Each structure stands twice: as structure tokens, then as C-alpha cells.
Assembly symmetry: D2
Homo-oligomer: 455 residues x 4
Amino acid sequence: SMLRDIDLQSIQEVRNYLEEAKAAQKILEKMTQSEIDKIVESMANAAREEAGRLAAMAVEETGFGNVEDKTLKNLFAANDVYNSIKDVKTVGIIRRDEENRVWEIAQPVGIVAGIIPSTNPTSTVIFKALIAVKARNAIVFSPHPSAAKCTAEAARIMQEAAERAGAPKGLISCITQPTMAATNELMKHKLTDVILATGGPGLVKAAYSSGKPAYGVGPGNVPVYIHESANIAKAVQLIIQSKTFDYGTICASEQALLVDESIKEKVVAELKQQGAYFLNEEEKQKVASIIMVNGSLNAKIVGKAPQVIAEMAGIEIPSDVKLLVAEETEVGKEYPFSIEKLSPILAFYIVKGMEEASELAQKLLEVGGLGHTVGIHAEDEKVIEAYTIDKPAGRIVVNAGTTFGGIGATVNVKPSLTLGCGAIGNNITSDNVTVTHLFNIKRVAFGVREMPKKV
Amino acid sequence: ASMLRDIDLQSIQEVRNYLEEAKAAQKILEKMTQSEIDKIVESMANAAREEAGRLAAMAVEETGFGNVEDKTLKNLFAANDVYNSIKDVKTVGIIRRDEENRVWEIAQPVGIVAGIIPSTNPTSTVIFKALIAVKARNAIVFSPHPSAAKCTAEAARIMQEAAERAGAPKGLISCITQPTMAATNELMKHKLTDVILATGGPGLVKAAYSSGKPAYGVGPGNVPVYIHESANIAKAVQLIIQSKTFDYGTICASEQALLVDESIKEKVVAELKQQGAYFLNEEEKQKVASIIMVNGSLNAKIVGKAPQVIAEMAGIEIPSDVKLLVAEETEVGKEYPFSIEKLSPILAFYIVKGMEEASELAQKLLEVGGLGHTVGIHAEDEKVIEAYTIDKPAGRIVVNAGTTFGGIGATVNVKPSLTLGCGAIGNNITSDNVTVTHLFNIKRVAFGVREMP
Amino acid sequence: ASMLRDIDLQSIQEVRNYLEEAKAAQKILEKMTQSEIDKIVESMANAAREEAGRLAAMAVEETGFGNVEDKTLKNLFAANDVYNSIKDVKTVGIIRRDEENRVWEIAQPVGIVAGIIPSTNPTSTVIFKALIAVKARNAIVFSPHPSAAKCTAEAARIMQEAAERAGAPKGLISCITQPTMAATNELMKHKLTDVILATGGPGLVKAAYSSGKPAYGVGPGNVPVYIHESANIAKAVQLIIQSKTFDYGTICASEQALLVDESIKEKVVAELKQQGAYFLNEEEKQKVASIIMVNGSLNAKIVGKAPQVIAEMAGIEIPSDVKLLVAEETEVGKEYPFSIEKLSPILAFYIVKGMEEASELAQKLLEVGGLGHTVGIHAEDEKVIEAYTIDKPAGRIVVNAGTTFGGIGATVNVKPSLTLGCGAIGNNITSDNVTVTHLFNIKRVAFGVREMPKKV
Amino acid sequence: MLRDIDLQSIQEVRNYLEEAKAAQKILEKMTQSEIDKIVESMANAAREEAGRLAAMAVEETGFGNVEDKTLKNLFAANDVYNSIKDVKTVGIIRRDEENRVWEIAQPVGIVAGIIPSTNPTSTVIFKALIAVKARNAIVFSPHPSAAKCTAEAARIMQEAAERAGAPKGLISCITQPTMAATNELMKHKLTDVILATGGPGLVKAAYSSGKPAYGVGPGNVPVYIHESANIAKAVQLIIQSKTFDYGTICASEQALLVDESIKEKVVAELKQQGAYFLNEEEKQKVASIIMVNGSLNAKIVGKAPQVIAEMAGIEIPSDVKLLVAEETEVGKEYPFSIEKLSPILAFYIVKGMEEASELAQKLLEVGGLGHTVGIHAEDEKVIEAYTIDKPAGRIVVNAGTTFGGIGATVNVKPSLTLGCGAIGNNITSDNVTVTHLFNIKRVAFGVREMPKKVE
Ligand SMILES: Nc1ncnc2c1ncn2[C@@H]1O[C@H](COP(=O)(O)OP(=O)(O)OC[C@H]2O[C@@H](O)[C@H](O)[C@@H]2O)[C@@H](O)[C@H]1O
Ligand SMILES: Nc1ncnc2c1ncn2[C@@H]1O[C@H](COP(=O)(O)OP(=O)(O)O)[C@@H](O)[C@H]1O
Ligand SMILES: Nc1ncnc2c1ncn2[C@@H]1O[C@H](COP(=O)(O)OP(=O)(O)O)[C@@H](O)[C@H]1O
Ligand SMILES: Nc1ncnc2c1ncn2[C@@H]1O[C@H](COP(=O)(O)OP(=O)(O)O)[C@@H](O)[C@H]1O
């Protein structure tokens, strides 16, 4: 009669972590800015040394992507995120407004529950560990099952690096054998203060039903408009690099191109030259047959090199092909090329001008991309202003790859791997989530006006 | 063939009718210019201002809470201060450009807002929520507390009518007429509900963060106020009494306990009595205590009641000019009724040796249903203020002001609001005074500025 | 359907109305004499009889299952056999005295009954449940299957109107006109509902026993029939074909697989063919197999359809005088469409070496969605019958009879019923054929006849 | 409270059900004679341990007294055993040759047995006997305040059963009772039937479990003393029943209804046999401790009168056998009109049979519907008239309702699980016994031809 079952063991595990995190966070909350910053620096530096190994671990365990790109993915969290927060004041009085007689104090949310995706398992741990601790919180991680080990390993490195710099034990922890029982327990336990839910909509929904404050994400289905004023060579190059990054595993990555008829041929030609393989009618359907199983995305094509996809669909492509492209006209969840494909596959739509492009992008976003990301390539300022203004996306990327743009690598939004899709994407915010979401502001404010007694 | 009858089913259908009309209304509204929106918002605030007294009378009459003068002032806070704080906010289209970084921001409405309305601030809260929601280009559907169903609906009606006159679409502002759990649940989980603004007790707030929907909740207050020996006592007492006795203590943020430095105790007692306080003796105390808590929870019947009314209920006898009741206290806990949030002109009175002992009791008082809400201190020595305030878990830390008027942003520079988020510690997504910027998302147009290695 | 969106609210409100009306009617009914009750029930059985054909034709027309001749007989079974088995049952006041034990028994109506009706037996099940419920002095509120809403509703009206002509109160018998989960949920959990009679799919029955109310549910059948080498083969095939093809196989207790001794295999095949069975060759079997299941369960579109219609749907070709389809089979499981409950004129045909192998296989077939329901055997060796039947988990173990007519108590002496409890093993509170004695509680008046001791 | 008691207790239930699964399959294979030998050995051990369990039960729960609990245990060991020992439960139990029908006994499988706080050890014995006799396994769940004595009772049963051939795991008991465990037990895949002897909350839960269940209801038994009653004999019978184990059995007298014409004699006779009639001052003090919050006060359950008196702060002679209180009102807020589970008796004056019936009806609606009523009378025509319209499964004539209700002194089946029929949310009004724990399979021969066509 000692606990034997995995659901039950995992609950016990979560409970221990929470007890230890509470005690750890109390200690951490008392430290100075400089004490905190030394801990954060050690972690980022630690992430930097292990970024390649963890990248390789993630590739090995998940079968997604490639080692070089995941290595770069880890460094983004270890470098860019770190740089974006290292100088942020998170301790004590963070703002004084002398003339209005008010000052702001940073206040930790306490204990954070972090849900980690399979696609970005190691990098997402870092990004969250960094911003959480910078704000003086504890954090308990819940991995995607198919990536439990490398995720846990990423967490370990953060804790141990933190500890070397003086952090208490249990500040950073991770469920080692994920279960439904464990995920529910973590989200709802009284000691759990805030949920960062980076996962599919089902899990994000559970988080907004948890009784707890939650920052969730939504899925992407990013349409990109190439206007006839675009630098076509520059645009095709930027897109391919982004689309093929880690073989297209991030959710802000391009899923469909929308192209002005008048430059249609040039863009096609530029694509082919730079490594695109245009599928013919025959090949499309074979590839389409493996894109969706049932009514949802086939997991076996996710983050797979184009040669692997070619073999799987039983077609032959040159070994130097960087991405597959299929010309399409229809949009809907029964047309596999119009959905989010999370792989080096791109749909290709022709448009008459700005209006048909907008109309189509909206159609594409209505398919599970709402509030996430859109892109346009164009040199005409009036067209850019008119196109972007009414698009339902928190990230509207101009003249950049959307993968790198969406996360804040190559455009100036805050570096993040947790992209809020706003209310339209069932989220409390459309922000790239960062350290400022993980502390509350307290306002010390002085009597400055007298309240009237009579009307 | 076609019948209905049970009130719950009718209330559910009503909610469904409102949301549909709200959707259509918001889409038409969303197409309006900043100028057109701002005119609509202006009309609402004007009408609100004029009807403040009438609405105040209905709420006092329907609920039994408070008095018409203070409720009139309360409605005006919403019609004036809240309006003034949002009327110049950019909410249409591009609201910000960052030329050096090559980014610009577009305001995006959340869609349809569900506003839950408490029984204590029923008309003022509708006015406040309607202004910030419509300014952000949303529709809003209200759910009254049952004790205040009629006046709440009337508040909504006045806004819709004021708004529509100024060009707003039909169905933009609506209100459930007979509140039920069924109807509340429908409003919270429905496909058309985009965001919940939940201002109410801990039970409703928990339900809102369990709805599957993005939510801004509140928490309850239990506001402790420290009077330091450096304080201007005569000025502190006056601010305290005006705040505590406002609308007879019905706002979540009213002082509930005074922590007083031993060294000035004598002047404070004398000063309280002179300014209208009645100190209950321990016999009077046990008797008043007997009606504060009822197995279990705060006795609704003393809520927002005049001190003479409360005195009669307890079976004690007090002078007219008496403005509030005070009880001496040493203990803190659910088993000590004078230590809880009382929502009435009743104060606890604790003696402390100094700041360190003051913080300890205050911490203990907050953990009884006040965490993350509001705290107060009266003092003139700036170092004592900083040391005391730095570690208090409250989104509002009010210095040298009444906490009623401070917490809502009337008399201290916090954002005008009647929905006070209590941060993670109060089970809320934010610690801000909720206002117009919380009801639109920002979309970012951002340009390529760097190469990837 | 301008307001069809709120059908959930309408259906709920309607249920509340029906239950309130039911409460008043039953209070009144409970006061009547045995003569009055018995006079009413009789009128209901008589009206059902006259209307048997018209109801039969509505059900066939509305649902597309079955045929008019057989449904007429199904309706008459409820109107005649069920009625006759209950006509003398005492349900008012003191129903039994036991003078030497100094006990007598007083009958107590359960109150208001919630009746769930299947699409396969919509009119006949209304008739059966109405007769036994009212005989026991209860009110009953019906929930139709949505595919069968109109004919079900019509059956209830005929019972109620016929009841009124013989003196019954209004609202005694009612029926939900717009079936919904919301309404079903309301009906099962509502304050005034006392007992649930759930004759429907497994999800609906499980829900009934999750309702907080006492419930009599059913289970599905997957009836295996053993033909032992001692069987009268000519007689058996006749009984089997009649039972299996009745209403085109919609009756759960209908045969689903034959297990045939290897040693007599040649005669059975020949007799089956002569009496109207078509043996599918291996390829015909696959095309028919491919329409048996859609999405991991039975395809509703073949249910209760004529053999020629099934043939057309599968794209195969059979004579017009074929009465049922038969396929040779070796495997058992959900992945073997011929091994599941087919609810249509289709039979599986398994060869077995002897009794012990039949029993192994019989257990396996039941485990695929048939536990506690029905099994059959045809044999003339009493020892073999006894050894085979003894350990089968089925409430009805039918010997030398069609299992359709046997299961329900038409041709064997079990209680006449269209609600077949599958016992604990089938997730039911009883394995009985549900009947009138299940719809009233017994109160016992008992006299002190013994002394409690005072010291140990 | 312990943080992880719930998970280990869930585990224990799971282990028990799985051993019970294996054990029952083995038990089910035995002959009638092997089963009957087992049941007899169980009865003997219950008989031998009656006193030791009684003492444990009194001490752990604070309810009742050791002599009566010992008698209570012996009722289960003897009366129940004797009433079932000759019932056939294996194989063919009946052969109707003219009608051509064989009946075969079929065990329900695994029973979940919920045990009340009032009759912990006696109920275990009772249920273990009828469950095993019908060839089932059973897993018990105690009320937490009686966990140790309940488990001990289960332990003795299994060991008694084992010596005579039973398999291990046949009879088990949750040692750390919890909601989680109870919940796990009622809904578990391996659970076949729930026997729910407990409060109204749990019975509702059992009928909400998705499983077949036999529940009980609460009692609130009114007994009418008609002018035709033998007053001396009636009072003697009533006091014996009412004070048995200090009134802990559910079907215990709670209110007397007395004909005005014999009021005088009855009051004096009650007094003569040890009743103490409370005055207005005493009434109000006692009434104050009968319920706390708006539910029955656990501190008076099964307590001697003197203990109750002291608790209410009144004093009474040490020889007082029961407290009585004259009453006119009926309702949830009149503590003397509700079920008191202790030696307190309401006393109602009535003008005749008709007023008595109305009041009886009102008392039953206060949590006694379907359970038990009593009447003392020698007038045959009144009894018949009084009893016919009472909604109760046990209608006891000229006997104590405690012993009548359980089937000790009137001829209902000896039992400690009393069903309240449909009117009390139960599938039966029977005293539950062994025939409720096996289903009947019917072997039925062809006796008719079906005609294929109608006119
Ligand atoms: N998973 C389930 N959960 C809850 N209830 C269910 C479930 N499955 C069936 N039911 C209950 O039974 C009814 C639906 O049963 P069906 O499975 O649909 O009956 P069936 O005859 O097998 O199929 C016919 C119906 O299904 C459709 O595919 C077909 O077009 C037709 O409407 C409903 O009234 C419902 O209460
Ligand atoms: N260990 C786990 N932790 C969190 N969620 C899980 C876990 N296992 C399963 N899930 C949930 O079940 C589903 C698993 O499917 P997933 O692995 O996301 O497939 P796909 O990648 O094709 O969407 C998701 O909705 C996920 O939230
Ligand atoms: N609008 C509403 N509709 C339905 N129920 C409500 C509503 N507002 C509050 N409630 C319920 O009533 C409670 C309010 O507390 P209550 O005791 O009625 O008044 P108070 O405590 O403010 O004096 C909440 O906890 C909530 O569960
Ligand atoms: N199966 C169970 N296991 C543990 N506790 C239970 C169970 N059923 C009810 N309770 C608890 O028992 C208490 C109610 O006891 P009650 O049923 O009133 O006992 P009594 O019958 O002696 O009056 C509640 O606190 C409830 O949580």
C-alpha cells in the first residue's frame, strides 16, 4: 500500500515542488536587485554553454527540427531575452513621480506554473525561467510528454546555475513524468498563483478554467502579403530563412503567401532559384494525404526536413530542396494546404491587388490563427498603412520573416516565446509575454486633493 | 406550442438576445471615428451627471444601503473623474508610433464585455464600466446583483438612451432584468462573451476565472490604517471619518481597523470622540459583535446602515450627532467579528508599540480577506512611510488620505475606478485600478530592422 | 425554426409542465379502486389494438426501420400478451396476506415514471410501458428518440386519450415532442421524477444511473446461437429465420451469430439456403462489411433495412426472394464487422468442433457488447443443453425458439416485456424482463411476534 | 489531516478491488456446500467476537453502550445467518417443469459496501454474510469516526472465511476513509453494485455514480398509541426499542402520538418505566443542543440521557431512562420533531385517528418518507384504517420499531440496510438481503409458435 500508479505519484511530486517553491520564493523576494541580477546572469550564461547540447537533446527526443537551429533557438532565450530584461528594475521602488506624489513598487506574483510545448521545449524553459526569476517568482514546469526529458534537463541547468549564484533550492522545478492528473493539480493548487500556458487551445482553455489568472497563447496560421512594390529578392530570401528555421516549428512562421498577379511570375522564379520546389497537381494530393490525419495536423510531418516529407508521401525531390510550395485557391479545414502546417510547406495564393489579399488573409486567420501574426512585404507606405490597420493579429510583421519577427528577434517587439493572441484568440493579452507580466505594480500615492462634502 | 414560465429559462433567453444585439452593435461601433466615439462617451457622462441624484435615490431605496447625498457624489465620481481620465485617450486606429525603433501600435477592441455589478455600488459601477467599455469601442452586457436589480437596469437604460441619442447603435448597452445563476453562467461562458469584468464577492470572481474566458477580477478589502506618532492627528481623524462614513461604509476600500501608536493614543481617542465617534464599552462591544457575524459571515443587515440603526439592532442606545461606532480590540481572526471587513460605520481600534508591531497586525488583518487590495498610513516622517509601505501586499497604498477616496482614485493619484484589481495574491490578473486601456488590445506593426545569424 | 435556437429551453419548460401535470394526475389515480384501474388499463389495451396498424405504419414511415406487417405484430404483442400477463395483478391496497407469519403486503406506486423510448421500437415500447405503469397506479412522462419523435408522441396520445375515455385524468400520460439532451437531463433529474425506465443506447442508460434517481436500464444484445448436432435442423432454421428477419432485425434479442457443429455443417447450410438465406462469397462479404461500420460503430443507415436494400447499398447482387444474408466468419471483435450487433437481416456463421468451443466463442461474442442480455441454443440432448446454458451471462437463455420472440417472452414463458434488463454484468439493477411488479414498492404490515432479549 | 492521505487511500481502494476481482472469480467456481461452509465459519467468528467489536465501536465512536452493541452484532451473526443459510445461490435454484423454466443464480460480482457511523461492526458482519453467500466479493468504506472498529470487523470476517476455504482479498476495508476514496470506489470500473448505508448525501451520490445501487433513507418514525392500546405493554416495548444502544438505529421511535382519552395513563406509565418529562425550561435548554448549525448535533448521538442532560446543563435522576418533551409543532426548526438518534422522545397529543394520521404524515416528510411507522392498538379495524395510506416500507404493529424495523421481532427479513422505496429515493422498500445480491438468469423453452401475419 505504497503509492504505485503514475497519476498518483505525479500528484505527490507536484505537491512537493509547490511546497519547496513557496519557501524558496519567500527567500528570493527579500534579495536586492544586484543579488537577483547575479542569479539571472548566471542562468543566462549557463543557458549559453548548454544551448547546443539541449538543442541536440530536443532533436533526439522530439524528432522535430535540426540541431543548429534549435541551438540558435536556445541562444535567443539566453541572449536576447536576457538583454531585454537584465536592466529592468524589479526590486523595490521602480518609479518615483515626485510632482504627482505617487511611486511604483514591483510586486512578485509568487509561484508560476509553466506549460512547455514539444516544438520549443528547451528554449521556452529558459525564456520563462529567466523572466520569472528576474521578477522574483518561483516556477514549476510541466513538459509536453514527448519532450519530458530534455525539458526537465533544461530546468535542471537553470536551477543549478541559479543555485551557484546563491539562489535557494526548489526555486525552479519540473514535473518529470507528466500526467493529466499532474497538470490539473498544478494549475489548480492553492499555492499556484499564475499560469503561463504555452500549448494548444485545449490546454490553454483548461488554464482559463482553472480558477487562476492565466496568460495563454493561441495557434498561428500566418498569411504574408507580397505587394507588387516589394523587393522580391529580399522578401523571398527573408521568408525562406524564417519558414525553414528549425524546419518551421514555431507558430508565427509563414503558412501561406498572397501575391500580386503582376509580380507573380517573378516571385515564383525567385522562389525556385533560392530552393523552393513547386509541387504539381499530382504531388500536391499525395502530400496533402499525409498533412492531415482525421481533422487535425499529422504529427509525423511536423518539423521534418523536406526530403523526409518527400519520402513519406512517396514522391521524389532533389536533395537540395529547402521547402515545398503548392499553389492553392481554396481555404478551409478540409484543404490541408490552407491550415497551419508547422513544417517546411507553404501554400501560394494569387491575388488581384490589396483587396483580395486582405479578404483572403482574413479567411486564413479565421482558420485558427486569430490574434496571432500576419506579414506584409511592400515598399509603398500608403499600402502598408491601409493593409495592416484592420488585421486581427498582435504581431503585424513588415519586411521581415514572421518567425523571427513574431518573437522579437528581427523586429522591435519584446523578445518572447509566449505570444498572446488577445481576446480574439482567447487570451487575456495580445502582448509578447515578458517580465513585466510577472510582477504587479503597487502604487504608493499621497493625498493631493480634498473630497467635497456638499453637492 | 409556444410557452415559457420558469424565470431561469426566460433569463437565459434574455442574455442570448442581448449578446446577439450587442455583437451587431459593437461591429457597427467599431467602424466609428475617434471623434464620433468621443461624442458618444460625452453624452453618456452628461446624462449620468444629471441623473446621479435620481439614480442614487433608487439605489438607497431599493437596497437599503447608504444615503442619497453620498451616493449622488458616488455617481458623480463616475460621471466626472472617470470620464475626465478617459476622454483624451486615443482608442481608434494608430495610437502610437515609435519612429526610432520602427514600430507602431493599433488599438483593437476586445469585443463584448460582461460586467458583473455588486449591490453596494450598483449605479455608480454601471456608469463607470459603461464609459470605459464604450470609449474602447466595445459593447457591454450587465448583470445586476438581485438586491439592486431595478436601479442597475435603470442605470444601464440611461446610458444606452444617452448613447443612442449621440449616434450609438441599438443593443450596445444592455442589462439582464431578472438575475439568476443560470443567466450569470450563460453570460460568462457564451460564444459571444469575449471578456468578463467581475466586480463582486470571492465566489463570483472564482467563477469568472473558471469560465474559459479572459477575466479581470477583484478581491475583497479589509483595510488596516496605521496612525504614526508623526501624523497630523486632527487632519488624519477628519480624513478617516469622512472616508469611513461615506455612504455608511459600503465601499470595499473603507477603513476597517486603526493601528495607533501607543505614544499618541490619548490624543486620537479624544480627537475621534470630538469628531463624532462613539466608543463602545466592552459590554456594548459584545452586543454589537453579536450582530456583526452570523454563523457564518458578515451580517447583511448592518451593511451600509447608519450607526443609530446598528445601535438599535444591537440593543444599545447612542446620541444622535454620533457619526460612527468604535470598539477597542486586541485580537485578529474569523472568530473575532470586529477584526473582519464590516462594510458599515464600525471601526476596530488597536494599540501598537511602533511600526514593527503595526505591520505585524496589519499583515494579519490583510490575510483575513484583504490581501492585495488597499492599505493606509498617516504620517509626516518620510522614512517611516517608506519602511512601513515597501512590504505591504496591496495594489493601493494610501498616504495621508481617506482610503475610500484614495483607493478609487478620487483623492490620490491612482486611476479613477470602481473595480480594484488585487494582483496574484488576491487571485486577480492585475493590481491596477481597471480603466479604459484594459478594454482594448494593442496590435503592433513592426518593421524588419536586423539580420538573423 | 425562427426561434429553434432556444428549443433547448422550450423542451425543458415543456418537461416541467408535463411533470407538474403528472403529479396531480397520479395523486388522483392513486385514490381509485382496483376496478377503476383495471377498467382503464383494459381500454388502453383495446385502443392500442385497433390502432396497431396505423401506428406501425407511422413508425416505419418516420424512421425508415422495419416493415408495417411486423411492427403491427410488435404493437399487438404489447396490447395482447403484455396486457394478459398483467390483467389480474393486484396493485391496489392489500395484495397479499400471510396470516401465520402475521404479515400482509400493501402496494405503493413509485409515483412518476420517466420513460425513454428507442427509435427501433417506438410505438410498441410506449404501449408496453404505459400499460404496466398505469396498472401500478403511476403517471408516466415519455422522451422519444429524435428520429422517432412524431410516431412516439402519437402512441402516447392514443394511450392517454383511450385512458381518459375509460375515466383516467389528464396529464397522466405525456410525451416530450422535441427530444434533446437538455430535456432528457431535465426529465431524469427533476424534483418530481421518481423512477427512470431507460430503454436506449449505452450512453443513455449510464446517464440514467448517474441521475441521482432509482433507474431500470437496459443493455445491448449480441446474441450467439448454438446449434448442437442433436438439434432438429429443419425446425431450428425456421425458428431462427423468423426471429432474425422480424421487423428486419431491429429487436435486440435477434440472432447475431450462428455457432454450428462441424459434423452437421452441410445440412444447415442447405436448409438455410432453401428457406431464404443468401451465403455471401468472400468478396461479397468485404463489400457488405465495409458498410456495416462508419466511424468505429454501427452504421445507422443499414439498420432495419431489407436484405435487397442492404445488397444495393453494398453494391452486390442477390435474388429478390432472399430473406436474409449470411456470412462465414472465424474472428470476433469490433474490428470484425460481422461479429458485432448488426440490427439488420445479416447473420454471422461460425463453425465449431463441439460444445466446449461454442462456449468459448459464445463468451467472446457476448463480451463484444452483449453481456447479460440473451443467448440461444437449439438441441435435443437435455444434458448438453444443461451443461452449455448453466454458465452463460445472459438473463434470457433461449432453448429451441427464436431469440427475438423468446427474449421478450412471446414464445417462451418469461414475462412479456420490451425492456430487457442485463443485470449487474450489463450495468443494470436487474436481469428481469421489466414488468408491473417493478413499478410499485411493497409496504409490509408486520406484527410483533418475537421478544428481543433483555440481558446477554 | 495529512497532505497525501487521499492518494494512498485511493491506491488502497484500487488494490482491494483488483484482489477482489480475482477472488470473486475463484469463489464463484465453488459448489453450494463449499460456500455454505465458508459463510457458517464467518458467522461463528462474528458470534465469538461480538463483545470485543462492540467495545471497540462504543469507545471509538462514543455512541451507545457495549451490551446493546454486542446484542446488535449477534443479531447479524445469528438472525441474519439463519435466514439465509438454507437459500440456494449456486447453479440451478429452481425448475418450473410445467411452465418449462429453469432459474440460474448469477452473482453481481463486486459490491461496494458503505458503512454507517451508528452501526459500524454489525453492518459489516451483515453485509459480509449476504454478499459472500451470493458468491460476491465486497470492499467496505467506513465512516471516518468509526474507521478502526469497522476495519477490524472486516478483518475478522476475511480470516474466518479463509480458514474454511475462501480466497484472499474477498473481504477488505478502506482503513483511511476519504471522499476521494469513496468516490473512487463508487465509480471504479471494477465496481458492480453499491450498497449505500449512510446519510442522505452519500445515497444521492451512489445513485449518481453511474452504477446500480441499493440505498437507504433516513427515518423519523412516528408511533400512534390508540385508546385501544395495551398501555403498560406498549410503553415497555417502546422504551426497550427507543433506548436500545441509546437510540442509534435509524428506525427508532422519534415521536409518540397519543389519544387524548388515554393521555393521563400513558404519561404516568412512561414515568413509571423510567421516562423524564421535560418542563418548558428544560425543553428549551435541551432543544438548544439537539442541533448545531441546522443539522443534528453529533455530540448527543447514542448518548445516555444523563450525558445529554449534563450537556444541556440540567440535572436529572441517575435512574432516568429517557427524556420526553410534549410538543405541538412539526418542522425542521423544531428540533424535537426531527430524527434525534438518541433517548429523546417528542410527545404529541391528538384527538383521534385522523389527527394522528395527518401528523404522522407531517413527521415523515421531515426526513422519514418510506422508512418506518408504528402503531399500538388492539382494535383491528383502526389498524387497517390507520396503516393503509402511510408511505413507509415497515409498518410495525404492537412492537418496538427498532426491533420490528430490522426484522428482529416482526417478520421482515433480518437486515441493517433498510430501503425507503421510490418515495425515499431508493430502488426498493425491502429489507435488503442475499436475494438482492444475485441476478436471476432464466432458461426458458419454446412453448408457442409466433404467427407471422395478422388479418
Ligand atoms: N455518446 C452518447 N452520449 C450520450 N447519449 C447518447 C450517446 N449515443 C447515443 N445517445 C443517446 O441515444 C440518442 C442518440 O442515439 P444514436 O446512437 O444516435 O442512435 P442510432 O439509432 O444508433 O443512430 C441514429 C441516429 O445517429 C445518427 O448518426 C443518425 O443519423 C441518427 O440521427 C440520443 O437520444 C442520446 O440520448
Ligand atoms: N503530458 C501532458 N501534458 C499536458 N497536456 C497533455 C499531456 N498529454 C496530453 N495532453 C493534451 O492532450 C493533447 C495531446 O495532443 P498533442 O500531443 O498536442 O498532439 P498534436 O501535436 O497533434 O496536437 C493536447 O490537447 C494536450 O494538451
Ligand atoms: N449578480 C449576481 N447574481 C447571482 N448571484 C450573485 C450575484 N452577485 C453575488 N452573488 C452571490 O451572492 C454573494 C454576495 O454576498 P451576499 O451575502 O449576498 O451580500 P454581501 O456579502 O455583499 O452583504 C456572492 O458571494 C455570490 O455567490
Ligand atoms: N463516505 C464518507 N466518508 C467520509 N466522510 C463522510 C462520508 N459521508 C459523509 N461524510 C462526512 O460526515 C459529515 C456528516 O456526518 P453525518 O452524515 O451528519 O453523520 P450522522 O449520521 O452521525 O449525523 C460531513 O462532515 C461529511 O463530510
